[PDB]
Design a protein around this ligand. Structure first.
Ligand SMILES: [Mg+2]
Ligand SMILES: [Mg+2]
Ligand SMILES: [Mg+2]
Ligand SMILES: [Mg+2]
Ligand SMILES: [Mg+2]
Ligand SMILES: [Mg+2]
Ligand SMILES: [Mg+2]
Ligand SMILES: [Mg+2]
Ligand SMILES: [Mg+2]
Ligand SMILES: [Mg+2]
Ligand SMILES: [Mg+2]
Ligand SMILES: [Mg+2]
Ligand SMILES: [Mg+2]
Ligand SMILES: [Mg+2]
Ligand SMILES: [Mg+2]
Ligand SMILES: [Mg+2]
Ligand SMILES: [Mg+2]
Ligand SMILES: [Mg+2]
Ligand SMILES: [Mg+2]
Ligand SMILES: [Mg+2]
Ligand SMILES: [Mg+2]
Ligand SMILES: [Mg+2]
Ligand SMILES: [Mg+2]
Ligand SMILES: [Mg+2]
Ligand SMILES: [Mg+2]
Lengths: 262, 230, 53, 180, 126
RNA sequence: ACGGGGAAUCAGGGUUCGAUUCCGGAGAGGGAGCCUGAGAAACGGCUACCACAUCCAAGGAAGGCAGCAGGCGCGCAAAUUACCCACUCCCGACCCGGGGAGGUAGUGACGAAAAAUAACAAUACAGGACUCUUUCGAGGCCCUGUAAUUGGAAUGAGUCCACUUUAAAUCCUUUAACGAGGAUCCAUUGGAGGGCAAGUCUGGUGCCAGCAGCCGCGGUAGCUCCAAUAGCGUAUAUU
RNA sequence: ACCUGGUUGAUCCUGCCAGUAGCAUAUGCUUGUCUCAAAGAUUAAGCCAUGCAUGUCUAAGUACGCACGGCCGGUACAGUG
């Protein structure tokens, strides 16, 4: 090509969007934004495919141009806006608040949250650097840059940000024993406790996690998002608590329920 | 429009909408005020024995030899199937909008809740046993009745008595009150609207056939006065 | 005209095949009337048993 | 780029040896007993049964406690019981290996209509189905090769609009009544 | 004995973002043909106690055998919201919108003819 | 010899295909050069050369379908110069405009799925089926056969109203009235057999055989069997 | 003795023949109803008539075209364009 591409074929779209094959040739190419193309949920997909509020793209445009949808407290009129992990979507007309959280199947789930929980979000620290006039700066996973952070905050930590002001309220350190969620790879959407961390210089670190049922798994350091301090998460969790269940143990729980009935 | 004998009829309470069932295994909906036919429903696998309805747009049917009780959600176009006592289910009656009672030809009486797939209570041999030694079988249940929005249940057989029952808390237990001596087949039982008396249809034979004949019985309508003292 | 419809053509082939089979083998029949004889001969010199050796 | 689908498959295979007396005799017997149209209808069912029995044999090549064997064998046995070819008491892979083609031929709507007494012949049953006289529950079905499930078997009857099902008399009756 | 047309509603939900109520419509007409959309609109207006001008129905498919039909319906809060939110062809089916009485070929040729003239004389191209 | 994801065939191992709707590369008749721009060595941009080729008042001027339709490529030959931005998405100052990208219909049995051309009863008259057997013979019957008659039920191919569908339509699905006895409202393709005169040719073993036979003295007003079945053959190459 | 049949006094070797199913190319006779899909190829990336295939404005960059227009002596500019 002689320049940037502007289209996206429907069969080449990310698989977690759950798009069918016969609707059309194309898929919505997300706009540039805070989140990456392969790890985002465009506003049109969330608004007409997940919630069924609209039937076509024109109705999505009509809904958005009435300034009804707010993302992280700000009105967005772009229907291909890339919304990502730990984003807050507010619709005051229907009195609804949503937070984008992976389910155990590796897909963004329709997760409704209380209006008091809608006032803050969690962000993973990506970079720390000293800018002009010796002012410390912190860069998060959703391209937020924050001045004058706490000196105790380092890379791979988690911060809680008030959406109205965009300022840090408190933070969770990256340590063994804290609760974490997997944001990529084969174990995407699984919640557990960090057990130990393996360091490889000049390469990728590997972290081991164990969930509530005792199952253990391992991922790369870049695929882990610290959620809570200790075992208590700082956000509400979806219907599954991060436990990926197998067919055998599903049969086991069905047998237990059948035995307990009667 | 029915292709066999009509076996059950009930008006929807408060309207002129009528439901009919038949031995042709179908349920039909009519509107009497507009003398018009509405629709036909299917799902039973044998001849249907009884039908009852109330204020809600819904009816319940007894499956007879099929051994099931079915609930018809007509505007929702849905069907609920309940599996209960052994033997043919010959009679059924609604207690309220959520509970109902049925009787079977193996002597059993069952209490149902419209949100659970099994009987809440099951009283086996409600009217006792009969027959020669070594060949004894329980009396068939011919009619059941319930007083609307209360816990009083009446059951009728050919055991020469009419029995009154109490539904327990949560309809999980059935308890006998008293016996009213009445000779013959108790083919029909209906409580009064006020609840001051109970009407029993008495015959020398069962309403569906001539398997028995009781010579001592009189083909009569019996009015049983119920007197309440706290 | 039978060749026009393949289904009825196959129907006639089955009807004839059962007729041709009657020469080889005897069809099983019930005693729907009181037994009154064979209606054909009884041959006493023909032996149909299968020799086992 | 188009928004169409190219997914398709064949449902039968022509026989490997084209001149076998036993094969021709078996086809003649099946077509005659079940009132089929041609050889392709037999070959279709033979193809289906071959797929099922190959899957059963491949599952039987595995260990009994293999999770894949348990999962896929249970799924296959449940499907076979649902369509009515197996019995609830015969839920093993060996009984799948025991299956024949007549068992599948008995589940067609054409033979079901004849065996339930709605028609007096197998060809009469085919004609009745093709002329929209037969209903399964609410639905009117005019496909002779409709495979009747276990639960649907008790709900096969004449359609409500049919002259045999209490509907309006047909063209010939009305014309003959108009004549006289 | 009379036959009846029965209207049933399913999957009712209230869309506050587009100011309407939308549902699936089932029509029972055992002996007759497919019921026209106008009569369905009048019956649904009587059912929901509104005027027929705010009801828009479409997508009616009759099942094989001829007993039942299934379609989709929307009821708007007001006629202004309907004129503002509905697609233009559904408004035209009610007589509220009128489209261009021309073809793509004519417009394209007229545009390409205008490309050759500069200035005010662009208005003189036929 | 564009590469890959992949397709076919196999017990496996492999082998043969992959221009072709997804990803990556390359080109815009051929070799070179360049402007603008964040991004081009761009061709529905520009400059010169080579090859083609249109108009001209002969001075000059204008070009690039390996985009969508469509035409040509000795005389011999195969999709429409169709409708629309309603869906999917893209571009713009933009909720609104544009889009042969895409969508909708049309067009050679090239490929895949379902599926008609009939069903049910009755009457009369005859005495012979059928199987195995290299011309001999052995078994066998609750029927068979008749280009024989008879009856009043069912239905869609079609004709023709109205809805429904859709951007507008068509198709499919509903539905009123017509619509069957040679139900002539008549299924085909390949293979293999029989039947004949004052007829023709050729060869002989007097009276025979071969090939074949709508052709005869006159005269001119719809046999059988087999394989598949809406499908079924042939040639070349090959596995 | 790794399919069924042929090429010998006997036993063999080497060259061979016929039958059985598919893929590709070209081509016939027939084709009542319906659903889905496809459409390249002269080592010619050979040549092309005609039409179309890329344009775009919000309250919010620039209107002294009466092009059309309300209110007027307040008269820099109403508004559409
Ligand atoms: Mg490109
Ligand atoms: Mg975009
Ligand atoms: Mg056929
Ligand atoms: Mg090459
Ligand atoms: Mg390729
Ligand atoms: Mg290029
Ligand atoms: Mg060229
Ligand atoms: Mg630029
Ligand atoms: Mg160039
Ligand atoms: Mg071009
Ligand atoms: Mg280009
Ligand atoms: Mg072209
Ligand atoms: Mg040519
Ligand atoms: Mg568009
Ligand atoms: Mg537009
Ligand atoms: Mg195209
Ligand atoms: Mg042809
Ligand atoms: Mg062909
Ligand atoms: Mg072709
Ligand atoms: Mg085919
Ligand atoms: Mg219309
Ligand atoms: Mg006749
Ligand atoms: Mg001769
Ligand atoms: Mg040799
Ligand atoms: Mg602006």
């Amino acid at each position: 090509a002689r320049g940037p591409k502007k289209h996206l074929k429907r069969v080449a779209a990310p698989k977690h969007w759950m798009l069918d094959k016969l609707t059309g040739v194309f898929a919505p190419r997300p706009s540039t934004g805070p989140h990456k193309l392969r790890e985002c949920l465009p506003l049109i997909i969330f608004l007409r495919n997940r919630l069924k509020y609209a039937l076509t793209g024109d109705e999505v445009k009509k809904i958005c141009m009435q300034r009804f949808i707010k993302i992280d407290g700000k009105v967005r009129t772009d229907i291909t806006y890339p919304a990502g992990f730990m984003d807050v979507i507010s619709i005051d007309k229907t009195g609804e608040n949503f937070r984008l959280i992976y389910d155990t199947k590796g897909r963004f789930a329709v997760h409704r949250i209380t209006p008091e929980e809608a006032k803050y979000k969690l962000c993973k620290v990506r970079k720390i650097f000293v800018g002009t006039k010796g002012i410390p700066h912190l860069v998060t996973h959703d391209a937020r840059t924050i001045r004058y952070p706490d000196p105790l905050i380092k890379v791979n930590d988690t911060i809680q940000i008030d959406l109205e002001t965009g300022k840090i309220t408190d933070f969770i350190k990256f340590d063994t024993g804290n609760l974490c969620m997997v944001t990529g790879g084969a174990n995407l959407g699984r919640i557990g406790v960090i057990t130990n961390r393996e360091r490889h210089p000049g390469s990728f670190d590997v972290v081991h996690v164990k969930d509530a049922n005792g199952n253990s798994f391992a991922t790369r350091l870049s695929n882990i998002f610290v959620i809570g301090k200790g075992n208590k998460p700082w956000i509400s969790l979806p219907r599954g608590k991060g436990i990926r269940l197998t067919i055998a143990e599903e049969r086991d729980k069905r047998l237990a329920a059948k035995q307990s009935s009667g | 429009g029915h292709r066999d004998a009509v076996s059950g009829l009930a008006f929807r309470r408060g309207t002129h909408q009528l439901y009919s069932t038949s031995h042709d295994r179908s349920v039909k909906v009519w509107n009497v005020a507009e003398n018009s036919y509405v629709e036909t429903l299917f799902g039973h696998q044998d001849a249907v024995a009884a039908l009852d309805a109330l204020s809600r747009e819904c009816c319940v049917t007894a499956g007879g030899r099929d051994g099931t009780v079915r609930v018809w959600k007509i505007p929702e176009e849905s069907q609920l199937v309940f599996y209960g006592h052994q033997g043919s289910i010959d009679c059924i009656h609604l207690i309220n909008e959520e509970h109902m009672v049925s009787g079977a030809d193996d002597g059993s009486v069952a209490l149902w809740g419209l949100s659970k797939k099994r009987p809440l209570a099951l009283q086996r041999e409600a009217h006792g046993l009969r027959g020669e030694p070594g060949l004894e079988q329980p009396f068939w249940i011919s009619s059941v009745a319930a007083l609307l929005n209360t816990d009083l249940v009446a059951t009728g057989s050919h055991s020469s008595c009419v029995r009154l029952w109490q539904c327990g808390e949560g309809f999980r237990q059935l308890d006998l009150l008293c016996d009213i001596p009445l000779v013959g087949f108790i083919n029909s039982l209906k409580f009064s609207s006020s609840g001051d008396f109970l009407v029993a249809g008495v015959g020398q034979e069962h309403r569906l056939g001539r398997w028995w004949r009781i010579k001592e019985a009189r083909n009569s309508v019996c009015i049983i006065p119920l007197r309440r003292v706290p | 005209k039978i060749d026009r419809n393949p289904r009825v053509k196959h129907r006639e082939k089955f009807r004839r095949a059962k007729i041709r089979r009657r020469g080889q083998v005897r069809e099983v029949r019930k005693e729907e009337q009181r037994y009154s004889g064979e209606l054909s001969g009884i041959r006493a010199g023909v032996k149909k048993s299968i020799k086992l050796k | 780029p188009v928004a169409r689908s190219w997914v398709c498959r064949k449902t039968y295979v022509t026989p490997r040896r084209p001149f076998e007396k036993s094969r021709l005799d078996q086809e003649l017997k099946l077509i005659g007993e079940y009132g089929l149209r041609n050889k392709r209808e037999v070959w279709r069912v033979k193809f289906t049964l071959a797929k099922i029995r190959k899957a059963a044999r491949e599952l039987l090549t595995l260990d009994e406690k293999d999770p894949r064997r348990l999962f896929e064998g249970n799924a296959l046995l449940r499907r076979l019981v649902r369509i009515g070819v197996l019995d609830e008491g015969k839920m093993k892979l060996d009984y799948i290996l025991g299956l024949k083609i007549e068992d599948f031929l008995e589940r067609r709507l054409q033979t079901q209509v004849f065996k339930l007494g709605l028609a007096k012949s197998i060809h009469h049953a085919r004609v009745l189905i093709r002329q929209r006289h037969i209903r399964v529950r609410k639905q009117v079905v005019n496909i002779p090769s409709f495979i009747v499930r276990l639960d649907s078997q008790k709900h096969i009857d004449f359609s409500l609009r049919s002259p045999y099902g209490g509907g309006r008399p047909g063209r010939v009756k009305r014309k003959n009544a108009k004549k006289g | 004995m009379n036959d009846t047309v029965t209207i049933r509603t399913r999957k009712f939900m209230t869309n506050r973002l587009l100011q309407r109520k939308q549902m699936v419509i089932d029509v029972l007409h055992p002996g007759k043909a497919t019921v026209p959309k106008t009569e369905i609109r009048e019956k649904l207006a009587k059912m929901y106690k509104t005027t027929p001008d705010v009801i828009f129905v479409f997508g009616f498919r009759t099942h094989f055998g001829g007993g039942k039909t299934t379609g989709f319906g929307m009821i708007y809060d007001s006629l202004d919201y309907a004129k503002k939110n509905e697609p233009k062809h559904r408004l035209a089916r009610h007589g509220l919108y009128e489209k261009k009485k021309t073809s793509r070929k004519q417009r394209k040729e007229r545009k390409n003819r205008m490309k050759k003239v500069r200035g005010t004389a662009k208005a003189n191209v036929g």
